[PDB]
From a paper:
PEPCK is an important metabolic enzyme that catalyzes the bidirectional reaction between oxaloacetic acid (OAA) and phosphoenolpyruvate (PEP) using a phosphoryl donor (GTP, ATP, or PPi, depending on class) (McLeod & Holyoak, 2021). PEPCK has three active site loops: the R‐loop, which coordinates the substrate (OAA, enol‐pyruvate intermediate, or PEP); the P‐loop, which coordinates the nucleotide or PPi; and the Ω‐loop, a flexible lid that is disordered when “open” and orders/closes over the active site after the Michaelis complex is formed.
Conversely, the holo structure and those with PEP alone were in the open conformation. Analysis of these crystals found that there was an open holo form (P212121), an open bound (C2221), and a bound form which could be observed in either the open or closed conformation (P212121). When nucleotide was absent, the enzyme adopted the open complexes and the P‐loop (which binds the nucleotide) was modeled in two conformations. In both enzymes, the R‐loops are well‐modeled, and the Ω‐loops are disordered in the open state.
Numbering used by the authors: 8 to 460, 471 to 622
The structure:
Amino acid sequence: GLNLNTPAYVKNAKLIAWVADMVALCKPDTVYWCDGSDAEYQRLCQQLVDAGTFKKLNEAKRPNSYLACSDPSDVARVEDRTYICSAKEENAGPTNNWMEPSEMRATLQPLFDGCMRGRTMYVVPFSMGPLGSPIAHIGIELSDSPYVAVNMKIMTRMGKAVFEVLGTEGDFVPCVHTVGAPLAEGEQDVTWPCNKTKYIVHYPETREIWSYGSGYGGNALLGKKCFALRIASNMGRDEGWLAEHMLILGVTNPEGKKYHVAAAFPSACGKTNFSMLVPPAGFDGWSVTTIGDDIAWIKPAADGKLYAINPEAGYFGVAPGTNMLTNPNCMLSVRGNTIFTNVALTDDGDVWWEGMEQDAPGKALPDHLIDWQGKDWTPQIAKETGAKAAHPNSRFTVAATNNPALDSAWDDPKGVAIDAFIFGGRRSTTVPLVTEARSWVEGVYMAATMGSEVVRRDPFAMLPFMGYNMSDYFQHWLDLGKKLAASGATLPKIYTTNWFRKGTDGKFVWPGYGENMRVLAWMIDRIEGKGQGEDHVTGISPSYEDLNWTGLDFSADQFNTVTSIDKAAWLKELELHAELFKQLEHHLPKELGETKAEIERRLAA
Ligand SMILES: [Mn+2]
């Protein structure tokens, strides 16, 4: 009908009929199709300013940037409200919340019925992956949040170009989102509409994503987690590829040899820092470049290699902790053209977040700020009330092309061949600085059992993002490796890393940040077959002499403190693995049991 305002370039009848069904359900006042243009982005930003959702930052301090502050009830992903509604509960598994699909549809129907009354529905077309490419997938998100529209513009390839790829019959992932705050005639809107009742629902068989009540981050920017991980992991299982919670980086040595690694880190462990790593002193001629900092789509090719693409177009990164010491490439990235969410406002109209004082003379805190809740903030107020100036989950949104270390192949549809996988974690004890798995299966075991500090397990860093049963996902990784090795291929190395072993004084021994290059360089030597290492109960680890210490005062005893293996600690660690496996017993692959038994055998030898 005429009420869809369908542009002429939309030729896809199934898509129009679907938009019509959701407009019939959600009943927005008007329907607007986002063309993705720069002018439209500025218009929507101005609408957000007019509503009070955005404040324009000072154009001298932070050009063409905006600050949004959210309702305190709507500040993060809500995992207890996130559902995998597969036909069978066993295909959701113990790491996912399940509900019978017909029961969830009956639950969501009255909530979405009229949810957009009084609001504009934004039709947000987007490609995950480079446009028109053989490995990209198209999504359409219907949303009543202009905040969602402008952030999706930065985070994805958004707008009119999508429809030339879809053509008249192409498929798309259907996404529906509402803040769940319908407006009556003459009602004054709030600056951050949301609902205390929240649902983030995935129907894997139909690829549907339904989001109700949150306008924040991973709940509402449906391309990032709901599509590019949860739905995408299901597609990869059926089609022979991988959707992973991994950065992708390129590392080039002084001879121009270039390697790519994919690395999964749990929350507060350093994917953005590592993906933008700056080589320290002693690594002249080396360069590290960013393909992606969060999501990897990885497909084996006929040539026996695993090719990864970053399906996103920008960064939606955690702000606190970012400074010129931990991550100068990220700091340079957010110099302008950035949307900041829930960070603090300085007196000169700039932004601030915990950790930025590391760049200030004397590392001094600012005298005064307006915090993410609009309150006066001072160091003394922070001391008295405990309030952080920026919310811990505060964010920047910025285009990938703002990154000075952006890899030249970041949008190459052919992807990059992965030479190694890295699985991080934060462990005060037990886990060495770096360990190389002796085999693919033993690497999958490492990824399956990774944890972060008590110690919480987060297999493959996918605990909140697996689109199906975690144990079947383990099996997918094992089968994929077997099939690759069967074609004669050389499987990528797998490493576990741990930056956070504590010394006898309780401090972190490993300096981390740019010095992580020294561990990465050892991996490179191993990939080339020229690196040495010590074999131990769980794998191979470098000796002190195997790393390049040029430019860092770091002693053998410090290195052995973070890298040496202790049988007593690993006996206790395997007990914790046993607890994890009981929480995951259904369809747990036998190969993981064989790996645990082999570690136990080496511990007793
Ligand atoms: Mn992430």
